[PDB]
Design a binder for this molecule. Structure first.
Ligand SMILES: *[C@@H]1O[C@H](CO)[C@@H](O[C@@H]2O[C@H](CO)[C@@H](O[C@@H]3O[C@H](CO[C@H]4O[C@H](CO)[C@@H](O)[C@H](O)[C@@H]4O)[C@@H](O)[C@H](O[C@H]4O[C@H](CO)[C@@H](O)[C@H](O)[C@@H]4O)[C@@H]3O[C@H]3OC[C@@H](O)[C@H](O)[C@H]3O)[C@H](O)[C@H]2NC(C)=O)[C@H](O[C@@H]2O[C@@H](C)[C@@H](O)[C@@H](O)[C@@H]2O)[C@H]1NC(C)=O
Ligand SMILES: *[C@@H]1O[C@H](CO)[C@@H](O[C@@H]2O[C@H](CO)[C@@H](O[C@@H]3O[C@H](CO)[C@@H](O)[C@H](O)[C@@H]3O)[C@H](O)[C@H]2NC(C)=O)[C@H](O)[C@H]1NC(C)=O
Ligand SMILES: *[C@@H]1O[C@H](CO)[C@@H](O[C@@H]2O[C@H](CO)[C@@H](O)[C@H](O)[C@H]2NC(C)=O)[C@H](O[C@@H]2O[C@@H](C)[C@@H](O)[C@@H](O)[C@@H]2O)[C@H]1NC(C)=O
Ligand SMILES: *[C@@H]1O[C@H](CO)[C@@H](O)[C@H](O)[C@H]1NC(C)=O
Length: 524
């Protein structure tokens, strides 16, 4: 139990990621774009920096970045949601109406579906929310447990005024996704056929079904379907606290989603992010024609420090979701372009040489608020999780960057590539020496990343105090993590380029931006 100072704890607050003024925040809830405003709702405990006397926090921004706090959107104030207003999604109807589906928990721990909608659709800010007088509207079916019946998705249109929503659950140890049909979002009929099911995954939380284009570079509206449209099916795997997705096709007639690769099905294949990243929700952004993904990153320190500091958990910068059209077998995740508006000044390091077993210092000034773009070339079974991280020297790795580092490397957070003997490229983040405090996460996170012919090794790092976001090969693989240095804070936080391979020297080019605050504040 490390004795944290006031200065160490205050440093942990992020400059440009979304978080409330104080207390606990988790799952993203019904994000929409409405009348010039980006709306974001979130799980919020008003009382303490722990999960959770669940209510829905509400915030708005013009550009998915400069957020403004609003009054609380939904409270635990009715018998059917007294134990919490759990997660949920918004469906926009063609007549301008917004239907917000959320899970309500009774004091008996029973979870039921309920409807909320704007009190006043003429208000762009959508401050006041009303609960549908006929709540609750849906309880668990026979197969599914009534204490584990949660997380309705955004609806997609079928015909004759019929919409479908997806609710994930389980049969025994089989993760499943049920589909309900509705015409008014007040009554639901359970379909006989499941959307999909995968053995040995456990409970599926926050399921998400959405179209991706196979030719365009735009996002698609959720109801879009056709011959050149693929569907991503995504579930949060509760037993793991990790998000998984797969690429396949969805048929409106059969109501079936089928994976393009069954060995990489939902829960047993790819992740959006290989670090701390959970309960991700997407929405369609009609202004820039994008699909944007939201997700929260839990604290990786002790609960004692959370209580001492007064708050817990951040949202990652929202990312775009596109199909990787170069591989055809993964998605590209990339921070929204508006994050670039935070860039202040840049410093370039052109063709820097790093020999085997070397550490090259990168003078950038302050290194706690950064956007780093780096390309790497090599001149002239492994597994990140079970590896020794940056200390495990191989012939062609590890090499890359050290962020959140002290002058003498007493604390360090490597983000690195490791090439292993066919050639597998690994992209990992090493938490093992991030902090001198023993009561934090000391894990090595990561996975393989595809590198195609001609491509350099590229990583983008978003550094923002106690959160690091990393992106390999344009976002084919991402790693989000939390760091809690005891010494590498304020002026003492430094940045290095390293190469710990035994038989390879690397050459790198970096552009490093200093990042401004997002100035997150209460709405005027
Ligand atoms: C690279 O190495 C890492 C580490 O070795 C691999 O990840 C590990 O993968 C194993 C399974 O291969 C996971 O084991 C499972 O552990 C669960 C409990 O986990 C708890 O304890 C952890 C401590 O180790 C802790 O970190 C967690 O927070 C958690 O509290 C078990 O419940 C689970 O059993 C149940 O599920 C299985 C099948 O899903 C089923 O049989 C039953 O329903 C069980 O109830 C499972 O236990 C297994 O391991 C022990 C064996 O004796 C059993 O037979 C197995 O069932 C492990 O959690 C995981 N560790 C991580 C991610 O840190 C990694 O594998 C890949 O990633 C994981 C997530 C998985 O998706 C694999 O399919 C991937 O291959 C390695 N990468 C590779 C091989 O590419
Ligand atoms: C490049 O790889 C080398 C070789 O592994 C790294 O040096 C090694 O660093 C590790 C971890 O710091 C040292 O291991 C020991 O870990 C325990 C923790 O349980 C610690 O208490 C011990 O004091 C010890 O540090 C190891 O001594 C050290 N080995 C050598 C030969 O120097 C090096 O740090 C890597 N470069 C990086 C990460 O930039
Ligand atoms: C989860 O596993 C259960 C236990 O293995 C399944 O029930 C078993 O089903 C067998 C063959 O269908 C049957 O001979 C066993 O008697 C029965 N065992 C028990 C303890 O009930 C169960 O399958 C469901 O329930 C049974 C009773 C049938 O109605 C099946 O058609 C059901 O699929 C599995 N549960 C689920 C929700 O799939
Ligand atoms: C919920 O609220 C009560 C009273 O407002 C509080 O005492 C309790 O500990 C809270 N639960 C939390 C913070 O998890």
């Amino acid at each position: 139990p490390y004795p944290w100072s006031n200065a160490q704890l205050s440093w942990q607050r992020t400059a440009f990621h979304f978080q409330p003024e104080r207390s606990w925040m988790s799952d993203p809830d019904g994000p929409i774009f409405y009348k010039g405003w980006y709306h974001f709702f979130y799980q919020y405990n008003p009382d303490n920096p722990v999960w959770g006397n669940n209510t829905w926090g509400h915030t708005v921004s013009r550009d998915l970045i400069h957020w403004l706090y609003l009054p609380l959107a939904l409270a635990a104030d009715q018998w059917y949601d007294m134990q919490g207003v759990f997660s949920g999604s918004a469906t926009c109807l063609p007549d301008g109406r917004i239907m917000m589906l959320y899970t309500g928990v009774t004091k008996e721990m029973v979870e039921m579906l309920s409807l909320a909608y704007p009190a006043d659709l003429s208000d762009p800010l959508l401050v006041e929310w009303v609960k549908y007088p006929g709540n609750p509207i849906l309880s668990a079916p026979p197969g599914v447990s009534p204490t584990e019946f949660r997380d309705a998705s955004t609806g997609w249109y079928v015909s004759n005024g019929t919409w479908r929503i997806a609710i994930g659950a389980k049969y025994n140890t089989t993760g499943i996704a049920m589909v309900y049909e509705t015409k008014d979002f007040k009554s639901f009929k359970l379909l006989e056929e499941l959307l999909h099911a995968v053995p040995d995954t456990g409970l599926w939380e926050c399921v998400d079904l959405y179209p991706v284009s196979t030719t365009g570079e735009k996002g698609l509206e959720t109801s879009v379907n056709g011959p050149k449209v693929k569907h991503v099916l995504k579930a949060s795997i509760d037993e793991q606290q990790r998000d998984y997705y797969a690429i396949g096709t969805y048929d409106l007639g059969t109501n079936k989603w089928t994976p393009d690769n069954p060995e990489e099905d939902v829960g047993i294949g790819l992740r959006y992010d290989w670090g701390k990243y959970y309960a991700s929700k997407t929405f369609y952004d009609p202004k820039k024609q994008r699909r944007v993904v939201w997700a929260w990153t839990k604290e990786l320190d002790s609960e004692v420090a959370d209580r001492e500091k007064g708050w817990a958990n951040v949202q990652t910068i929202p990312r775009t979701v596109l199909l990787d059209q170069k591989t055809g077998t993964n998605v590209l995740l990339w921070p929204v372009e508006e994050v670039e508006s935070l860039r202040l000044s840049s410093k370039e390091f052109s063709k820097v040489k790093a020999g085997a077993g070397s550490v090259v210092p990168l003078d950038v000034g302050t290194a706690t608020q950064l956007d780093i773009i780096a390309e790497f070339e090599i001149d002239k079974g492994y597994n990140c999780t079970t590896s020794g991280g940056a200390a495990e020297r191989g012939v062609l790795g590890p090499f890359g960057l050290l962020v959140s580092a002290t002058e003498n490397l007493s604390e360090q957070t490597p983000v690195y590539f490791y090439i292993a003997k066919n050639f597998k490229t690994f992209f990992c983040l090493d938490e093992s020496r991030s902090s001198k405090a023993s009561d934090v996460s000391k894990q090595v996170k990561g996975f393989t990343v595809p590198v195609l012919d001609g491509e350099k090794f590229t990583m983008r790092l978003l550094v923002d105090h106690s959160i690091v976001e990393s992106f390999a090969q344009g976002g084919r693989s991402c790693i989000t993590s939390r760091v809690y240095p005891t010494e590498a804070i304020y002026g003492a936080a430094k940045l290095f380029l390293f190469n710990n391979a035994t038989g390879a020297s690397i050459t790198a080019s970096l552009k490093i931006w200093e990042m401004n605050s997002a100035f997150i504040q209460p709405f005027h």
